[PDB]
Amino acid sequence: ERMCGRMSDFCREHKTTLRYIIWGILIAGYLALVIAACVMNFHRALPLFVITVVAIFFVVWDHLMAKYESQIARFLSPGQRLLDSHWFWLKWVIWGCLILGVILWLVFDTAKLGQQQLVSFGGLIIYTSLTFLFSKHPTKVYWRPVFWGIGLQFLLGLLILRTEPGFMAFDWLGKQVQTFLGYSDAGASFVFGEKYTDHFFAFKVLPIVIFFSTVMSMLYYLGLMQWIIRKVGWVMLVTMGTSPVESVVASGNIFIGQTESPLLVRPYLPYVTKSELHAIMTAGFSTIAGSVLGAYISFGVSSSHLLTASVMSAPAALAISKLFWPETETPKINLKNAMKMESGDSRNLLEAATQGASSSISLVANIAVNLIAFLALLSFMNSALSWLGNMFDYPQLSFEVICSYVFMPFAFMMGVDWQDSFMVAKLIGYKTFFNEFVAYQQLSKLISLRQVGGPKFVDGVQQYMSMRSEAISTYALCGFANFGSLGIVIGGLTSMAPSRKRDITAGAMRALIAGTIACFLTACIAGMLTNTP
Amino acid sequence: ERMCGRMSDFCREHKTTLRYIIWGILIAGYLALVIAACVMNFHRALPLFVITVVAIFFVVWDHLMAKYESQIARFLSPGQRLLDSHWFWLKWVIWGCLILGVILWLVFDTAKLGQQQLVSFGGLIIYTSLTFLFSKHPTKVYWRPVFWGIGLQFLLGLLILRTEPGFMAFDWLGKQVQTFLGYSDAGASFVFGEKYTDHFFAFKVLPIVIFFSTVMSMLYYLGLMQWIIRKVGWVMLVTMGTSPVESVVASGNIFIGQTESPLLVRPYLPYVTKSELHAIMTAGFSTIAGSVLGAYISFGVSSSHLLTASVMSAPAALAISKLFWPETETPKINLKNAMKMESGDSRNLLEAATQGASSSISLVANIAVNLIAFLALLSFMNSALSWLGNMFDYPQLSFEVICSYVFMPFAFMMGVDWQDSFMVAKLIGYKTFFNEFVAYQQLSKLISLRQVGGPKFVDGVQQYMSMRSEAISTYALCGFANFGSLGIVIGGLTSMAPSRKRDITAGAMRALIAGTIACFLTACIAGMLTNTP
Amino acid sequence: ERMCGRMSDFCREHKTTLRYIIWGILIAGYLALVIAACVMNFHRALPLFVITVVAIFFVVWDHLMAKYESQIARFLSPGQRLLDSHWFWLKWVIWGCLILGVILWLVFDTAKLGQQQLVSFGGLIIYTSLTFLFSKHPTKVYWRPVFWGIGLQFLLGLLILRTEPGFMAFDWLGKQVQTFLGYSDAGASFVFGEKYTDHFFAFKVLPIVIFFSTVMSMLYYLGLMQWIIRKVGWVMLVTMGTSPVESVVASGNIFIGQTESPLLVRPYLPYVTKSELHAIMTAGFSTIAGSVLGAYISFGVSSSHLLTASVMSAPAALAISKLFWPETETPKINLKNAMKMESGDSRNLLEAATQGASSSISLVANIAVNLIAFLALLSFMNSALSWLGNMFDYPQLSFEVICSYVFMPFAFMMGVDWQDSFMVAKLIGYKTFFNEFVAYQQLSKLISLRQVGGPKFVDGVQQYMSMRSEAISTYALCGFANFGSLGIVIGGLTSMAPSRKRDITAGAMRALIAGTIACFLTACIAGMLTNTP
Numbered sequence A, B, C: 001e002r003m004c005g006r007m008s009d010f011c012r013e014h015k016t017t018l019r020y021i022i023w024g025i026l027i028a029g030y031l032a033l034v035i036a037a038c039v040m041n042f043h044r045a046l047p048l049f050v051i052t053v054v055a056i057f058f059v060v061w062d063h064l065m066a067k068y069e070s071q072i073a074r075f076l077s078p079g080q081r082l083l084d085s086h087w088f089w090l091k092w093v094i095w096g097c098l099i100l101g102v103i104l105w106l107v108f109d110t111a112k113l114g115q116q117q118l119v120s121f122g123g124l125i126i127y128t129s130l131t132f133l134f135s136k137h138p139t140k141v142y143w144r145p146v147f148w149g150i151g152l153q154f155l156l157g158l159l160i161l162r163t164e165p166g167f168m169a170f171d172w173l174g175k176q177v178q179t180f181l182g183y184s185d186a187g188a189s190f191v192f193g194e195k196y197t198d199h200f201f202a203f204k205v206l207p208i209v210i211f212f213s214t215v216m217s218m219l220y221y222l223g224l225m226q227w228i229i230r231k232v233g234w235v236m237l238v239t240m241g242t243s244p245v246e247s248v249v250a251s252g253n254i255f256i257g258q259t260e261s262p263l264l265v266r267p268y269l270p271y272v273t274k275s276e277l278h279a280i281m282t283a284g285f286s287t288i289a290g291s292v293l294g295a296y297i298s299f300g301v302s303s304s305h306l307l308t309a310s311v312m313s314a315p316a317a318l319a320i321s322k323l324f325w326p327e328t329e330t331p332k333i334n335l336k337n338a339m340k341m342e343s344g345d346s347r348n349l350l351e352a353a354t355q356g357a358s359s360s361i362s363l364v365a366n367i368a369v370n371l372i373a374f375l376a377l378l379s380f381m382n383s384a385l386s387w388l389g390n391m392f393d394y395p396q397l398s399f400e401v402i403c404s405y406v407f408m409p410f411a412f413m414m415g416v417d418w419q420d421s422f423m424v425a426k427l428i429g430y431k432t433f434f435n436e437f438v439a440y441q442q443l444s445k446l447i448s449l450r451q452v453g454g455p456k457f458v459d460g461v462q463q464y465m466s467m468r469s470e471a472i473s474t475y476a477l478c479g480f481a482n483f484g485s486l487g488i489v490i491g492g493l494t495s496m497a498p499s500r501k502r503d504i505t506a507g508a509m510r511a512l513i514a515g516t517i518a519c520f521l522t523a524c525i526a527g528m529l530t531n532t533p
């Protein structure tokens, strides 16, 4: 077998120069395909060209930043020294300019839009003040992250809701998700037959969750999710001055659930401070997961609003966390250790797809069973309250009626008009007590009723509300914050970090409240930036 | 933050006087609501007043018994001494009075009712004699628990089946369960749609199990289940003289399954004797769980009979256990340790609801899969037997035909007439070989056929039987005693108590047989107390 | 209790003579039933008589072989010595006779059948040559097992496909499975109702898997599966000269899955060589399980072909394994330890049935979820390829189109004509990339289209192919070889044998390729033995 030995020797001698050549050939083939498509017709091949251009730009950018990091740092050093020298007097000028800009924006846009937007701004101020008043360490507050997070939220709102480029970009992005969630019908129609629509939720909506979980697992295997997570976390870390671990977890909670996001920094969990753990739990409560995005979109909830709220919930979560539980210790973990994410154990793309598919069984099972139990409990409680109410000639007493008055003030401060505040309060109660699935189902009911166009009032009962109120509710209801989530979060985090069980149990409730407050702040900004139709 | 320190100091100084005042205010509000409802209309508010009165009475009773236990014991001591002094001659008088009462009741009621009731009494005697003959230690029999359990069963039967108060109370109690099992339709119609009735069992009956499991978990969190369990166990312990652990487990098996009832005394399992372990397994085999009560009621089985049999199966189980495996060792565990039940790990009511909902997934999955497999096996076996039978010009051979002759004597001794004994034997075989779900399904078929009113015989084949036979079958079929339950019971108990694996495997079959005998004794009492229509 | 002691003493004294008498009485009763049935009518009772005769013959044979093993070995010794003495010159004569027989069979049958059969023979030769060329140790090849396995495949093909006895026997055997898979409808119609056919796959096909798993568990408890496995493994061990462990696992993979077959030799896994482990994984990839046979038969795939391919895949797997990774070490495990199979933990038949039923939940769940995900991915990929294709005025681009050209040569060498090779290639791609469920679904579509009788071509597109091509595809697609199976096989085997994780991961890909090659060799033999209609 001399030939086999010669082949092995040749492979070992120039292994690097062989795989690199193969990859170069593949890249050349792809580029040839792209250029040929452009030559045959440019307008038809435009998106492929754009994708190729952006990918090339990002690859070159990453290569340059990895290669010339030290030179760039040295080149940026003198400016930082000059700014630090003149800061003691330039800070007042910068702060005054920002305050004047805020005042001018208020006077010339928010006052023009109406009273409800000013009420949204006042509600934002009130929520921040209440978060500060009940803070764990009111005298140890670092105010840089709070202002920077609020400002990042405001900038995102301006870019997405008040400019044609961002509005078009996010409308397109949402429209792509609607097309993408239709592919699960292919499997749903075979496993459950052509009559799979006879049972809409179980046989059409949960398959969307399965498919999205599979796709997310595949993307995590490919390393595309961590690439975006690192960029977002670096932005929030360089602006807000937050710790690398909490920044990474907040950036990852945009796309990942609360029970899986901490796995990004699993090795370093035992050494995190109490403030970082509280921030992790708040970020886990203040966001949703991509797996359940398709279900909410199928209900009828706007995809653009959901994406915008998911993006805006990270800085809000970090700001509310740092204001509700500021850091009094010294962090140990550094940026390099935080930004590395140990990838799963998948040998290829199809194994990752199968692993993502398998993990979705318990998710959908728990969703279905919890929905059944919660709706049965709701029916029983409403019946019991009607039984009690009839003893006072008020058989209309119900859970919705009580929630319409208990949670009304929170909706009013978010900029919802007087009439629709009592209707948003019911959704707030639904989310608080059972989950965000029921609240979004009711919101979809209301949206469909509005779209139909029937009467707004029947027998003195309001049937649907405005579109601005629907948007505010969509922003407010985007979160996994409920009492039931508390225990499972605690158990899973204690499981991941047994040694921190004492600390985990102490901050869970504050993290839940902070997540709620962050969702409400996102809703306040959305309300103050939206006009009245 | 001086204000925060002052508030913390005030909270710490008078923590007891603050929460107590809050609870007092809540109680005052509830009482104000009740009295206002009564004032506005008394007849309409009567049940609320009754519930409040009974709750107040029980609270005061528990407080007094906890406070003045020693004084009451000292006050009762002299009478016990006098009774112990005169017992050596008063025992014969008491026993003769009881025997004379039994003879008079027989002569003047059971003989009037007919022959079948006397046959039921003879069957009870025969079952007790057979249990004694094949006893593990026939010479170590303590006869107090056997007679006391049989007497408690007889008293319960008299109270519930032969008096208007108890009959009305249990009919009302059963009617409340029927109303309560309709609330799961709210969740079933959303998760599975308005067409959830197209698949009756899977999409309407299992949700009832889920909802009942959730409610039971919530009640266990609230501590209401243990309150009733302690009372029942104290009654059976002070009358029958049984050990606290086995009494507690028997009282808990009325509402809880066989695989979860032992958790009430989990810490003390490794130190229980062999007789106590056998009694635990018998009590686990002789009862059902509240989770599956709603399914049987949905089939069409009487709820009152099911509740009565569940209540009556505990003393019967303990008596048959103490007669089939009497105690030859010394018990170690005391009353205080047995009556304390370590509650689960739930921080609030909604977490308990979610935990109860999640645990029901495997239950319903196993139920469905086992039913599928058992029915497929039944079809295959019937086909094979018909194939064999045709070789003798008897293609009618089937599993039902064989069971109608194998188990006929057991039904006859229970007081079922000659004709319907062959039909009850089929249900007995169904329960023995597959489970109690199939037997109750067949019984529901028979009940519906009787209710329709069609011909009782077609082509010489009996279609339905009497209502007394249906009641006897309902009493006899109430149990988790089957060969399949044996292994899972063994595995779970060995799991809970690894050190007792050798002892657990030795008594499981005797416990199963004892559970069957206890169910049959309950059926015998029901048959001897029911009249012929 | 003197009577009890006397009974215990009598039972202990003659325990052996009592159970033996009981068994003798049962056997006498069975024989009396059989003889009475024969007397009443012989033609009607013929199959029962045949079954009894064969069972008696096998029992007597096993008894004699166990009793007189040494005497038979001594009686056979002299002939072996004479053959070993004359072998050095008799081997050439035997080999020449075999080669002449092969040449004569070719010339006088395969050339008569047509060109495609000669192409099948050439493809068999080419696959063997390619397996040898890329062998792990080309210079350590033991050629006895390769030739013996190919010859056993050829003999099985001749017996089953070219003789009336075998053809009738296997047609009858397949027809019995079709009758047997109809019994699950009894359970499926109750759990899911009379409308269970509205969802064909989920509510009719998976119950077949559950029932077959239950039956296989019951048969394993009864010890009937190991009885056949030992016979087949002894045949392959005495002919091919393979190790006992790999022979046993190959014989067991005919009826058992790849994740459960290794349990037959679980204790001895840590001491197996690398070649034996590779052979185990190849045998696990080259066969199917009886649990999923009923689903494929329900789709419309021939049962006789499936059984024949399952039987023929074992020697092919062993030959390809020994040619792709020959043995360079010394085996430690002996025949006695390999042939003993530690049976499960079931106390009776019904416990085994329940255990088999419970284990099927995850199987069906994974099947359904994987099918959903794979079909959604297929739809998305086809849409994306059409999007790309339209940029070159070829919107017909699809996964099927690419596979019809990538895998065409493999189908052509298997003896499929030019036209149908492009259609078999699509099925090959389906099996390779997703699983054998999709490929068999598409094959059932094609078979139904052929059966209908419509036009073979519409608008220049071929709709269905010949029956010989369908048979070849059925033989080729019978296997669990896919990329997704690789990881789960690796994880499960590493789980069973943690100490061999390094060796397990090294041979999995070669085992997968060997399984594919073995399936293709079975297809080549089937094609060369089938005529053109």
Ligand SMILES: O=c1nc(NO)ccn1[C@@H]1O[C@H](CO)[C@@H](O)[C@H]1O
Residues within 6 Å of the ligand: A256, A257, A258, A259, A289, A290, A291, A292, A363, A367, A435, A436, A437, A479, A480, A481, A482, A484, A485
């Ligand atoms: O924990 C979760 N992790 C997820 N990852 O995709 C998805 C859902 N959930 C839980 O399910 C509830 C309803 O969605 C939600 O409140 C949340 O607590």
Ligand SMILES: O=c1nc(NO)ccn1[C@@H]1O[C@H](CO)[C@@H](O)[C@H]1O
Residues within 6 Å of the ligand: B256, B257, B258, B259, B289, B290, B291, B292, B363, B367, B435, B436, B437, B479, B480, B481, B482, B484, B485
């Ligand atoms: O073990 C159990 N524990 C339960 N707790 O609620 C409910 C059911 N079961 C098992 O399911 C079978 C059919 O109900 C029954 O025979 C019993 O063995």
Ligand SMILES: O=c1nc(NO)ccn1[C@@H]1O[C@H](CO)[C@@H](O)[C@H]1O
Residues within 6 Å of the ligand: C256, C257, C258, C259, C289, C290, C291, C292, C363, C367, C435, C436, C437, C479, C480, C481, C482, C484, C485
């Ligand atoms: O591993 C398995 N073991 C089985 N035992 O009965 C049955 C199926 N499977 C897997 O399911 C896939 C599709 O059937 C198949 O490719 C195979 O990988």
Ligand code: NA
Residues within 6 Å of the ligand: A252, A253, A254, A255, A256, A257, A258, A261, A283, A284, A287, A288, A289
């Ligand atoms: Na998240």
Ligand code: NA
Residues within 6 Å of the ligand: B252, B253, B254, B255, B256, B257, B258, B261, B283, B284, B287, B288, B289
């Ligand atoms: Na019970």
Ligand code: NA
Residues within 6 Å of the ligand: C252, C253, C254, C255, C256, C257, C258, C261, C283, C284, C287, C288, C289
């Ligand atoms: Na197999």
